[PDB]
mmCIF file of C-alpha atoms and ligand atoms in Angstrom:
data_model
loop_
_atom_site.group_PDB
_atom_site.id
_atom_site.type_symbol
_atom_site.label_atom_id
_atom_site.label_comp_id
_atom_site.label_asym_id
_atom_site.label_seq_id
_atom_site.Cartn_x
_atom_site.Cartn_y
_atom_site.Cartn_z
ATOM 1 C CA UNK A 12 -25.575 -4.611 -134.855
ATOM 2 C CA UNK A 13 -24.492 -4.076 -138.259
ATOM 3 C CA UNK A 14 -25.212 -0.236 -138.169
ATOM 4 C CA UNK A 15 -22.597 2.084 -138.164
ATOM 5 C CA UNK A 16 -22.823 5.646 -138.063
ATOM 6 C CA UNK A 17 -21.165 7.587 -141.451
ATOM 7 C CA UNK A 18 -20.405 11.063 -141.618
ATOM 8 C CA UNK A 19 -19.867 13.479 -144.821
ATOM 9 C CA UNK A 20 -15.838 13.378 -145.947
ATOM 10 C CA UNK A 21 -15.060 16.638 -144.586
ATOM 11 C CA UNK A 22 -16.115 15.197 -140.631
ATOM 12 C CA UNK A 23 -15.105 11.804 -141.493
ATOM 13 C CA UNK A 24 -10.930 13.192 -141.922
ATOM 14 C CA UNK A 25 -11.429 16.796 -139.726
ATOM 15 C CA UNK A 26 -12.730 14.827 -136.605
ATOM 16 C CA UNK A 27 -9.486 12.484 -136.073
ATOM 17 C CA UNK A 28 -7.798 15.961 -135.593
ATOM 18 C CA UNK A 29 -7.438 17.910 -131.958
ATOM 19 C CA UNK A 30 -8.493 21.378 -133.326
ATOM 20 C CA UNK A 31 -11.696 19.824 -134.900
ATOM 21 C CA UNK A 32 -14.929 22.079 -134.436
ATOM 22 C CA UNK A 33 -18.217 19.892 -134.375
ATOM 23 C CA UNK A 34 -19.938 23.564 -136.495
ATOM 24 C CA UNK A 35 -22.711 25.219 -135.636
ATOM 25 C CA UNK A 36 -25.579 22.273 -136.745
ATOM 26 C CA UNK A 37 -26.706 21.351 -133.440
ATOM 27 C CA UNK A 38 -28.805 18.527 -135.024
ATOM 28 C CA UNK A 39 -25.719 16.470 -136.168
ATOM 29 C CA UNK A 40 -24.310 16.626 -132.433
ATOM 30 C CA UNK A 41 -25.569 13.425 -131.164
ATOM 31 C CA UNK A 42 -24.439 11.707 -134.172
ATOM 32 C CA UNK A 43 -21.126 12.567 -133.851
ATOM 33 C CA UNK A 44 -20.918 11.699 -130.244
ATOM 34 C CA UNK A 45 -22.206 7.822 -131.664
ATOM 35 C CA UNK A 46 -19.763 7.881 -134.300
ATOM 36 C CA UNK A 47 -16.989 8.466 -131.767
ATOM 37 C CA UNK A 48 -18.069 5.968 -128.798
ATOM 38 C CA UNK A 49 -18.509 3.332 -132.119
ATOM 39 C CA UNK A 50 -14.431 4.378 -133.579
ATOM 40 C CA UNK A 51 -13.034 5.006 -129.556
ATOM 41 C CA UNK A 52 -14.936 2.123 -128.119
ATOM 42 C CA UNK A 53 -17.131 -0.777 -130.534
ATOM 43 C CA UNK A 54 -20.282 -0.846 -131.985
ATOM 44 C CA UNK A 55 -21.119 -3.095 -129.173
ATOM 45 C CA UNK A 56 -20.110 -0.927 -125.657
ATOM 46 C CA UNK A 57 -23.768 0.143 -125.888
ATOM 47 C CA UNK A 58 -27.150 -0.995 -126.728
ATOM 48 C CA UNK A 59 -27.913 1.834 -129.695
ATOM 49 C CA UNK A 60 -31.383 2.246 -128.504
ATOM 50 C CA UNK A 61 -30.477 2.595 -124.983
ATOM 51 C CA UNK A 62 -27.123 5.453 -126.202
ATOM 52 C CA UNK A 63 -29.531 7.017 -128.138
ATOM 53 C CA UNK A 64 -32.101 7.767 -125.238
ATOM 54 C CA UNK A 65 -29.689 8.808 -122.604
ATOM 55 C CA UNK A 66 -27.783 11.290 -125.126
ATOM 56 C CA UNK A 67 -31.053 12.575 -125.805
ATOM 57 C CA UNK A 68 -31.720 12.912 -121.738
ATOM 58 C CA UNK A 69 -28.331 14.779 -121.270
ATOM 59 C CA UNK A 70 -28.486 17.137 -123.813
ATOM 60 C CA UNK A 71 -32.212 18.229 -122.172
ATOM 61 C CA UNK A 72 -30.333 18.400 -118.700
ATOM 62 C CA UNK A 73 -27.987 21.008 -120.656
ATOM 63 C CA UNK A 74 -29.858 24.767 -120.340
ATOM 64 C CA UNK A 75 -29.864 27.893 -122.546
ATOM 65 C CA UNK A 76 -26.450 29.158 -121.004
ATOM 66 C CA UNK A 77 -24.220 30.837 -123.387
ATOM 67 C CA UNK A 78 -21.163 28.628 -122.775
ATOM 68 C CA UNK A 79 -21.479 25.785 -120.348
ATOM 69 C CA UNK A 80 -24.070 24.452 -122.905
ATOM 70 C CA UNK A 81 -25.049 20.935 -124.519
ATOM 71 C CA UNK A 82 -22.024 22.360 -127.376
ATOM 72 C CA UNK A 83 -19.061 22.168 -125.048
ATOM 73 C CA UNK A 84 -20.396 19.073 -123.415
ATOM 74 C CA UNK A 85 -19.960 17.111 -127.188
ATOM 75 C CA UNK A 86 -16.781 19.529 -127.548
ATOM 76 C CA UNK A 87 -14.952 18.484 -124.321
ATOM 77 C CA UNK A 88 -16.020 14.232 -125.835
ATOM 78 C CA UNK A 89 -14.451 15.047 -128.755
ATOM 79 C CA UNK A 90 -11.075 16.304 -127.320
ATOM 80 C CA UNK A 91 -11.239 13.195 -124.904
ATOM 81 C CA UNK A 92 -11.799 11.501 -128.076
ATOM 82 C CA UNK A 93 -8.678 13.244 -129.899
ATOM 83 C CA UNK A 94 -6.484 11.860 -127.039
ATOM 84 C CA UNK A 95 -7.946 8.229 -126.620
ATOM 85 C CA UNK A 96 -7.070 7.478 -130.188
ATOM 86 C CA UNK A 97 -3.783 8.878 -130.316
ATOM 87 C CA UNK A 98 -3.098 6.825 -127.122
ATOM 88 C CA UNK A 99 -4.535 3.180 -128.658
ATOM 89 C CA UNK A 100 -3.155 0.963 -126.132
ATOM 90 C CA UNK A 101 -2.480 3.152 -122.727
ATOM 91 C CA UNK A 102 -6.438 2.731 -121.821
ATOM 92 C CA UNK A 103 -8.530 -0.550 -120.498
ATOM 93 C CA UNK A 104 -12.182 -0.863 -122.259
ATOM 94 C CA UNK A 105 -13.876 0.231 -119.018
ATOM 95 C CA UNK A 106 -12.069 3.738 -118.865
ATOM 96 C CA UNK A 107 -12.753 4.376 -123.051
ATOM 97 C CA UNK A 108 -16.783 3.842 -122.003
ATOM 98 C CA UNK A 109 -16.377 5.889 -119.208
ATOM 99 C CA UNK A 110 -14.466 9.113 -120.059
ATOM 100 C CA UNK A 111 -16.523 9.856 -122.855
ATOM 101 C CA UNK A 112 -19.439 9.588 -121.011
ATOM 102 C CA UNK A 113 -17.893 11.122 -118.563
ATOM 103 C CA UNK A 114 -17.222 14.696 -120.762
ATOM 104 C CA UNK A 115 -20.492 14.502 -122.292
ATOM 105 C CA UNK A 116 -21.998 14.913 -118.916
ATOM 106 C CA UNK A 117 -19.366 16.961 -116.819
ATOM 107 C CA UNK A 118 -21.289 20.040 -116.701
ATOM 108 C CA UNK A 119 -24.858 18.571 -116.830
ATOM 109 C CA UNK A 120 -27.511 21.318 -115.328
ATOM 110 C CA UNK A 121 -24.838 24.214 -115.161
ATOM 111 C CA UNK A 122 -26.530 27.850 -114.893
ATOM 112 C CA UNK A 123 -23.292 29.462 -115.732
ATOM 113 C CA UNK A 124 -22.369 30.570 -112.598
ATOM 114 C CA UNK A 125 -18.966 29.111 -110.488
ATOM 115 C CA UNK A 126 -18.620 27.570 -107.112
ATOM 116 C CA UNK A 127 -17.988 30.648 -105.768
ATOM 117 C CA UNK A 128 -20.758 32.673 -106.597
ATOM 118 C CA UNK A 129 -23.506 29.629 -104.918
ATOM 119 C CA UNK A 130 -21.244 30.193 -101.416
ATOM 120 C CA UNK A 131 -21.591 34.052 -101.581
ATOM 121 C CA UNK A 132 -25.260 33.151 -102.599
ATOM 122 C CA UNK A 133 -25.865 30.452 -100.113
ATOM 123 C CA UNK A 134 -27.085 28.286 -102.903
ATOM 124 C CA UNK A 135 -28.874 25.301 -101.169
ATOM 125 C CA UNK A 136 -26.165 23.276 -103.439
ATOM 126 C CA UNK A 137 -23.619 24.705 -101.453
ATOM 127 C CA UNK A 138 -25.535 23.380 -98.282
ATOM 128 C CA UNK A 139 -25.308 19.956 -99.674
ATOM 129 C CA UNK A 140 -21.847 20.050 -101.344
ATOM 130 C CA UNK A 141 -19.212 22.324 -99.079
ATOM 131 C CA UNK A 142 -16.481 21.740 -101.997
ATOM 132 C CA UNK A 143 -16.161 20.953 -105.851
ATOM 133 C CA UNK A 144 -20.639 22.205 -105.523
ATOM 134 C CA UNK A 145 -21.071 22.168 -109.071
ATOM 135 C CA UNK A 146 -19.450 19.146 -110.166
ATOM 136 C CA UNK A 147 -20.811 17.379 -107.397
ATOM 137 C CA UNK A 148 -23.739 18.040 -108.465
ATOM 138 C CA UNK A 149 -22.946 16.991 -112.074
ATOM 139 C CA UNK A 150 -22.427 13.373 -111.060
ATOM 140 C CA UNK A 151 -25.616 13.568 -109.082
ATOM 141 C CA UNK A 152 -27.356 14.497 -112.357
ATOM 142 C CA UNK A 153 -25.154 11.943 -114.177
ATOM 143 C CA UNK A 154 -26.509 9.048 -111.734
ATOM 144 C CA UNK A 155 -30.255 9.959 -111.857
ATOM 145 C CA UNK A 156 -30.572 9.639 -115.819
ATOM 146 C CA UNK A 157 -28.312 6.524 -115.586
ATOM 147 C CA UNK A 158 -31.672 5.490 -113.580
ATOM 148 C CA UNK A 159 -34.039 6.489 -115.800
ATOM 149 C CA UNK A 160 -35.755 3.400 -117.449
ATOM 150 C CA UNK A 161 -34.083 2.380 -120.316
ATOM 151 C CA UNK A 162 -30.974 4.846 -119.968
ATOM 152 C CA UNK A 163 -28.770 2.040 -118.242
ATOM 153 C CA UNK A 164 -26.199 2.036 -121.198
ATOM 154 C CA UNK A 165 -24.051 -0.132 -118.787
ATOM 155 C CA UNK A 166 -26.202 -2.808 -117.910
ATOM 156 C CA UNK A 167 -24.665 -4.906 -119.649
ATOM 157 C CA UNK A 168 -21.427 -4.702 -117.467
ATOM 158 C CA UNK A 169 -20.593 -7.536 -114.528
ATOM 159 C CA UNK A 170 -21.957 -5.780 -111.085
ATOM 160 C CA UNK A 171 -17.950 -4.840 -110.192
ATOM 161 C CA UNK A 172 -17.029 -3.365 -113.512
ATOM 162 C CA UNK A 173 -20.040 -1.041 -113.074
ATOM 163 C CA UNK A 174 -18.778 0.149 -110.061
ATOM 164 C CA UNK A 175 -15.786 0.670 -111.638
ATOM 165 C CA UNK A 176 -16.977 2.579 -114.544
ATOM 166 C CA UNK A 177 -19.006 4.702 -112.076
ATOM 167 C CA UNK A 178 -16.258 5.570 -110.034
ATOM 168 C CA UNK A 179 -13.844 6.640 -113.061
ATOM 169 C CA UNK A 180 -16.868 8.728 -114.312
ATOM 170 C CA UNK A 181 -16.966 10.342 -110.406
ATOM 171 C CA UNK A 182 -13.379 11.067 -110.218
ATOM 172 C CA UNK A 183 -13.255 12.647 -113.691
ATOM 173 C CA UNK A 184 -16.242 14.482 -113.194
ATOM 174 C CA UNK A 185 -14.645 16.187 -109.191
ATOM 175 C CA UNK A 186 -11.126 16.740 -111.875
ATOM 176 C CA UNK A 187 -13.029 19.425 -113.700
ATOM 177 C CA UNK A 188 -13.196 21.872 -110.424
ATOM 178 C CA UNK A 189 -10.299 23.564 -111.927
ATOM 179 C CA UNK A 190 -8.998 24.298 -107.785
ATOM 180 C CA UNK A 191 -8.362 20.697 -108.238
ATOM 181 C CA UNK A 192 -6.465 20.768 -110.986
ATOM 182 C CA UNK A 193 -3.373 23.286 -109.954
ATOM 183 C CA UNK A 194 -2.239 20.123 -106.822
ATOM 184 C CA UNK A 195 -3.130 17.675 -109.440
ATOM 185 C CA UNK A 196 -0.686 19.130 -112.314
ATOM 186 C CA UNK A 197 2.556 19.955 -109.659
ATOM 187 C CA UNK A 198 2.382 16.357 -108.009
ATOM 188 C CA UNK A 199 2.043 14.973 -111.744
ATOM 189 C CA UNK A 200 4.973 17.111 -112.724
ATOM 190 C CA UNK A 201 7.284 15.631 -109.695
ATOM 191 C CA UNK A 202 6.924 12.369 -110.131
ATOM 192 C CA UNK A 203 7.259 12.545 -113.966
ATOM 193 C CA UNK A 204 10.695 14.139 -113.215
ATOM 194 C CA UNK A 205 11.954 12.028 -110.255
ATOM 195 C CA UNK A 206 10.844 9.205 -112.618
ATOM 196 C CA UNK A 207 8.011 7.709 -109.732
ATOM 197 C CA UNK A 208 5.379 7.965 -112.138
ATOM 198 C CA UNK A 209 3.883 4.119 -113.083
ATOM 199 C CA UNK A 210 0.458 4.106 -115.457
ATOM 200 C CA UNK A 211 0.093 0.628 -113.346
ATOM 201 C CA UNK A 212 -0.057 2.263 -109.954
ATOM 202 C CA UNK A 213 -4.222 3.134 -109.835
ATOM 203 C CA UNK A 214 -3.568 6.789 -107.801
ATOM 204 C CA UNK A 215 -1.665 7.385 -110.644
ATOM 205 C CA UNK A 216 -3.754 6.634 -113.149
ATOM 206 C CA UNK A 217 -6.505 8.998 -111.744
ATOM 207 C CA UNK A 218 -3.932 11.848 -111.381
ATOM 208 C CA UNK A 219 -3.314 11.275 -115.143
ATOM 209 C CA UNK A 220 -6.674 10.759 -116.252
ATOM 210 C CA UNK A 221 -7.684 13.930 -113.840
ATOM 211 C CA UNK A 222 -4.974 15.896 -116.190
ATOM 212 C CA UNK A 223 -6.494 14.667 -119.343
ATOM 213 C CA UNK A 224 -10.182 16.082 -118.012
ATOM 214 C CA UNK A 225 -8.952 19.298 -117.588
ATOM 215 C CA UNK A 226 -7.061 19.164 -120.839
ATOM 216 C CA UNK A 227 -10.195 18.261 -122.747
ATOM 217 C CA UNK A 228 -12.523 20.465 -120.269
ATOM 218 C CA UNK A 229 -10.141 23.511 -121.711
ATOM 219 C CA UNK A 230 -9.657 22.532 -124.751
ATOM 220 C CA UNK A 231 -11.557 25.606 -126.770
ATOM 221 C CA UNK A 232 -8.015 27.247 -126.371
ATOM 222 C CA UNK A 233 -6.375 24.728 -128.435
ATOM 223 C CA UNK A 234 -8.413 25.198 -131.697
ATOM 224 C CA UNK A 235 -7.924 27.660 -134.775
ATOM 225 C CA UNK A 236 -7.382 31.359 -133.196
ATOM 226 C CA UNK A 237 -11.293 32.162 -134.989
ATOM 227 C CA UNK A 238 -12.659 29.621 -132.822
ATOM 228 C CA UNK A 239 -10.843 30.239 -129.736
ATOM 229 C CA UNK A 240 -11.352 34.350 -130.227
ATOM 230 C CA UNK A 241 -15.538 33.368 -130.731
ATOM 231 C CA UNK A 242 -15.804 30.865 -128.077
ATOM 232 C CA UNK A 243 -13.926 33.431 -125.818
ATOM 233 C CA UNK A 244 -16.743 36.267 -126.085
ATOM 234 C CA UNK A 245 -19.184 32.831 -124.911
ATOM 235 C CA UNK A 246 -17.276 32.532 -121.621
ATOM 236 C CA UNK A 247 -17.064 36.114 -121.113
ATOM 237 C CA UNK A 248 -20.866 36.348 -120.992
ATOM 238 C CA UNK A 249 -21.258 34.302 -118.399
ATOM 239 C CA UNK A 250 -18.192 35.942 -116.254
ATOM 240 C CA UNK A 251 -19.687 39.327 -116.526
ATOM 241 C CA UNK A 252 -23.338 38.284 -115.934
ATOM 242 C CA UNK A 253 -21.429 36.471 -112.568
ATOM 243 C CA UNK A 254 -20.201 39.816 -112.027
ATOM 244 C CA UNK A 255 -23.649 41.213 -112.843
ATOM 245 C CA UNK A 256 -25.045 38.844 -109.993
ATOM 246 C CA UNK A 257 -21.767 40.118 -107.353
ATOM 247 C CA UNK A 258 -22.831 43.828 -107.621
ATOM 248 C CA UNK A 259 -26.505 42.699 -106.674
ATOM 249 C CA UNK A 260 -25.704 40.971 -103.511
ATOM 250 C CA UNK A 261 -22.835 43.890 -102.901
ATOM 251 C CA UNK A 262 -19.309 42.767 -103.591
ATOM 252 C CA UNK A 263 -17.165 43.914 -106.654
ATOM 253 C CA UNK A 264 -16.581 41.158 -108.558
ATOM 254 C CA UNK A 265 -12.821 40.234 -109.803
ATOM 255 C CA UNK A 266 -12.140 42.111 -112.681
ATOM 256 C CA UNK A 267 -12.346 38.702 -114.879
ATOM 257 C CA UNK A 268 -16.056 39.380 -113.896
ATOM 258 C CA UNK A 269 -16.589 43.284 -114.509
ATOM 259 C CA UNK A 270 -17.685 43.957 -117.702
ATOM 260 C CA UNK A 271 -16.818 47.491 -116.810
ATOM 261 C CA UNK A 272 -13.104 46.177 -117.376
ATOM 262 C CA UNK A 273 -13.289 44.584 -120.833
ATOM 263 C CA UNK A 274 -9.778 46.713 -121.707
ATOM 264 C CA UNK A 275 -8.560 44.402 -119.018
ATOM 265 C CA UNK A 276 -9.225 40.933 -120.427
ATOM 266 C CA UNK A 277 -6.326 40.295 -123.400
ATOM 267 C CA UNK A 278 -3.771 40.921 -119.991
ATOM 268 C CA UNK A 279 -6.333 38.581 -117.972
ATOM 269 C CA UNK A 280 -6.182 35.843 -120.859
ATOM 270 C CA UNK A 281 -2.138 35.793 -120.974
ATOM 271 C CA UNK A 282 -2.075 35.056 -117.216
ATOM 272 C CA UNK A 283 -4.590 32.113 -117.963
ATOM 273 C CA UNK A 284 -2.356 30.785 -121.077
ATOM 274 C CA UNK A 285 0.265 31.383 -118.669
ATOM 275 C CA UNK A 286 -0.746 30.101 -115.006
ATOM 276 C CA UNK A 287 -3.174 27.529 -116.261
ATOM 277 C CA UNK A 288 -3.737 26.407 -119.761
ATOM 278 C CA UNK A 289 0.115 26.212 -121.210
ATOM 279 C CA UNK A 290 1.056 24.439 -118.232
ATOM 280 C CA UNK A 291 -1.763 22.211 -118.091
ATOM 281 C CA UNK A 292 -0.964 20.937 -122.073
ATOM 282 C CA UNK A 293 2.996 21.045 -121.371
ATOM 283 C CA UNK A 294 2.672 18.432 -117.908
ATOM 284 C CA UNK A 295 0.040 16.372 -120.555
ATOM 285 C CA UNK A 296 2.395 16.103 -123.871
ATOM 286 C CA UNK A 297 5.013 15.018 -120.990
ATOM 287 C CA UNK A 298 3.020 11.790 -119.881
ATOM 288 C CA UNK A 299 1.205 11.470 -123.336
ATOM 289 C CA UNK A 300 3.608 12.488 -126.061
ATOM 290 C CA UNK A 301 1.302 11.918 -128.979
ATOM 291 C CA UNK A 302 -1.209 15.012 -127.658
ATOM 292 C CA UNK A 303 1.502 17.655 -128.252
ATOM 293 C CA UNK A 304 -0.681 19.234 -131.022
ATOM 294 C CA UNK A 305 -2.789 20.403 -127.979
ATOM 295 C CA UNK A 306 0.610 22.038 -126.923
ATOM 296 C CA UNK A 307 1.541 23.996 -130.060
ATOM 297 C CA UNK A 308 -2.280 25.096 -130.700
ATOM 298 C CA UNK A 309 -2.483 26.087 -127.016
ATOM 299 C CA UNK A 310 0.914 28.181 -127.638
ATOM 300 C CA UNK A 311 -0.464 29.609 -131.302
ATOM 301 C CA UNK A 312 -3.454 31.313 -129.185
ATOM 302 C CA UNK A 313 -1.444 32.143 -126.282
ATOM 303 C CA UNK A 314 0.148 34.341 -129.215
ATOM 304 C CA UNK A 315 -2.373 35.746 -131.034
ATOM 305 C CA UNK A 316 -3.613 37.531 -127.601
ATOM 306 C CA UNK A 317 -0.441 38.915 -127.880
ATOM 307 C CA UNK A 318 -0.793 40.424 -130.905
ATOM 308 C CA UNK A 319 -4.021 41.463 -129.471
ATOM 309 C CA UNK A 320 -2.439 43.728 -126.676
ATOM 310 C CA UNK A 321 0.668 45.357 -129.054
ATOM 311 C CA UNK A 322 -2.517 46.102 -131.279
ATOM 312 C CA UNK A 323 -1.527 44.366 -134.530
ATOM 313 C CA UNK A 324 -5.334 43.031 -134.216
ATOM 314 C CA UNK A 325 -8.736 43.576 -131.591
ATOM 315 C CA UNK A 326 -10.830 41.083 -130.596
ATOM 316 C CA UNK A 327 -14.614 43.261 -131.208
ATOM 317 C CA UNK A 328 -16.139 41.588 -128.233
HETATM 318 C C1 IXT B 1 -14.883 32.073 -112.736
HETATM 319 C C2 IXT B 1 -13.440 32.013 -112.291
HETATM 320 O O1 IXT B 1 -13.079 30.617 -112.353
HETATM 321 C C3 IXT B 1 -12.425 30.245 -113.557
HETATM 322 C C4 IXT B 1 -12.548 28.726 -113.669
HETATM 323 O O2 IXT B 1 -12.570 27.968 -112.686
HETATM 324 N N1 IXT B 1 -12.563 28.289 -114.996
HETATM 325 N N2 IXT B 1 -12.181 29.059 -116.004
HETATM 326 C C5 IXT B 1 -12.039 28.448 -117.148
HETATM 327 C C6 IXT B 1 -11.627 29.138 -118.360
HETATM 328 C C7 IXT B 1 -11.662 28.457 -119.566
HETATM 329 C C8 IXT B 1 -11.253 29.099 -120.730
HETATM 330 O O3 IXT B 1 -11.263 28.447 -121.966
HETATM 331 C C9 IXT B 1 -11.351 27.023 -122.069
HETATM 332 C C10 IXT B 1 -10.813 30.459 -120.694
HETATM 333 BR BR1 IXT B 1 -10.254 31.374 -122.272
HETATM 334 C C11 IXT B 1 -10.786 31.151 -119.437
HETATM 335 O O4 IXT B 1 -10.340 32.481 -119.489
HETATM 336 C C12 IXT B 1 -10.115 33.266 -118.323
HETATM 337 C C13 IXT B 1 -11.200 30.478 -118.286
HETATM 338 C C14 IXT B 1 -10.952 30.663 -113.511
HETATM 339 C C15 IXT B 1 -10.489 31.623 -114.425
HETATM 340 C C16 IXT B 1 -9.164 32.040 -114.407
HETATM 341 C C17 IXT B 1 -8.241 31.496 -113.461
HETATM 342 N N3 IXT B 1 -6.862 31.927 -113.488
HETATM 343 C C18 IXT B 1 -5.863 31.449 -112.600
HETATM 344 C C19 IXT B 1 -4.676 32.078 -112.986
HETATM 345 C C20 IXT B 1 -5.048 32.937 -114.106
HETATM 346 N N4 IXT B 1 -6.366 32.818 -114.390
HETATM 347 C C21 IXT B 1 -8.694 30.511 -112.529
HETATM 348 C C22 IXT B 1 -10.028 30.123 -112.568
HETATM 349 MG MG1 MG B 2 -17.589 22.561 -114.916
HETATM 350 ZN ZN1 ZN B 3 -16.767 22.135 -118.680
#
């Protein structure tokens, strides 16, 4: 009850910021997560004991993968984190418990490889989920350890507020399948303009909160260039191994995927600053004007890959 979590000075002031890293001390991870929910939410959303032993059950559910790994799970929290603090009073208590529950368990049981590879595959998984297969699948994994005994860190909820909370958790999980996200952003972006959009209407609210989950899901390439150029070599493992895994069943993989093509990737991560990422940040500091810091980092990195092609700098890979 009376036992809050503390961290060392540097944490304590670095983790109020956007471009906060949580460093390389794996250990520390789950009590950094705590110390957020406590700051984001009360020391009360959750029975401690029962936090504790479903953080513990996620990050096992998290495997060896070099990117979409128990670190980006606490990484994407801590953006969502970022944004719910900067936004005090735009968010009920329910949707503060759920979204960062939600990020820490967006990608549980990923094996690095995207939608599109289990169709090409025929991954049972694509059997049982024909779109969105992967985050599907991460709710499903989300709702089993929510069911283990003594992981119910909602119990405590009224029976309609925890089918609230489970539904906001659902829909924010299904926003992460970034096909979803490029519909999501242009509707968001008319009704901002034509003036329609109302934080009361509840299909609004889940467009919004949709944006935000993407926004937090991306948000490696709003932190310091040295962590955005590090964590970028991380997600290019896994695209090439995908690419690896095309040429065995006999398609050429995109050339994202080839790691035949590695010249081709500072061009490749321009059109993603470009088509996806700037966008997605611009459309956010729009509805949410106190996450613009997500904007300017985002724009920072867009050009330092610049400087990357004119080669005033290489990324080693
Ligand atoms: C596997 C292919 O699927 C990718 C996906 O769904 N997620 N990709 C996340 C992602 C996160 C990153 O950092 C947070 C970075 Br860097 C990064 O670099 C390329 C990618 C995908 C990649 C590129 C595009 N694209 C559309 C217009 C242009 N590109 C669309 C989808
Ligand atoms: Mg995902
Ligand atoms: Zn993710």
């Amino acid at each position: 009850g009376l036992m809050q979590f503390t961290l060392p000075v540097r944490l304590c002031k670095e983790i109020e910021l956007f471009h906060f890293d949580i460093g390389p001390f794996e250990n520390m991870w789950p009590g950094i997560f705590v110390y957020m929910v406590h700051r984001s939410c009360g020391t009360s959303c959750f029975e401690l004991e029962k936090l504790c032993r479903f953080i513990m059950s996620v990050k096992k559910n998290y495997r060896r993968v070099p990117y979409h790994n128990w670190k980006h799970a606490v990484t994407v929290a801590h953006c969502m984190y970022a944004i719910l603090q900067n936004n005090h009073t735009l968010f009920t208590d329910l949707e503060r418990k759920g979204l960062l529950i939600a990020c820490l368990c967006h990608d549980l049981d990923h094996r690095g490889f995207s939608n599109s590879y289990l169709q090409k595959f025929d991954h049972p998984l694509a059997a049982l989920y024909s779109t969105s297969t992967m985050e599907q699948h991460h709710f499903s994994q989300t709702v089993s350890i929510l069911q283990l005994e003594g992981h119910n860190i909602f119990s405590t909820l009224s029976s309609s507020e925890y089918e609230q909370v489970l539904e906001i958790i659902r829909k924010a999980i299904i926003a992460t399948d970034l096909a979803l996200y490029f519909g999501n952003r242009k509707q968001l972006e008319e009704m901002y303009q034509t003036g329609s959009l109302n934080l009361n209407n509840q299909s609004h609210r889940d467009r919004v909160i949709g944006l935000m989950m993407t926004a937090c899901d991306l948000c490696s390439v709003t932190k310091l260039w040295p962590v955005t150029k590090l964590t970028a070599n991380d997600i290019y493992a896994e695209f090439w191994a995908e690419g690896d895994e095309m040429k065995k069943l006999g398609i050429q993989p995109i050339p994202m995927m080839d790691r035949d093509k590695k010249d081709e990737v500072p061009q490749g991560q321009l059109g993603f600053y470009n088509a996806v990422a700037i966008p997605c940040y611009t459309t956010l500091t729009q509805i949410l004007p106190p996450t613009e810091p997500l904007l300017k980092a985002c724009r920072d990195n867009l050009s330092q890959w610049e400087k990357v092609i004119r080669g005033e700098e290489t990324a080693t890979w």
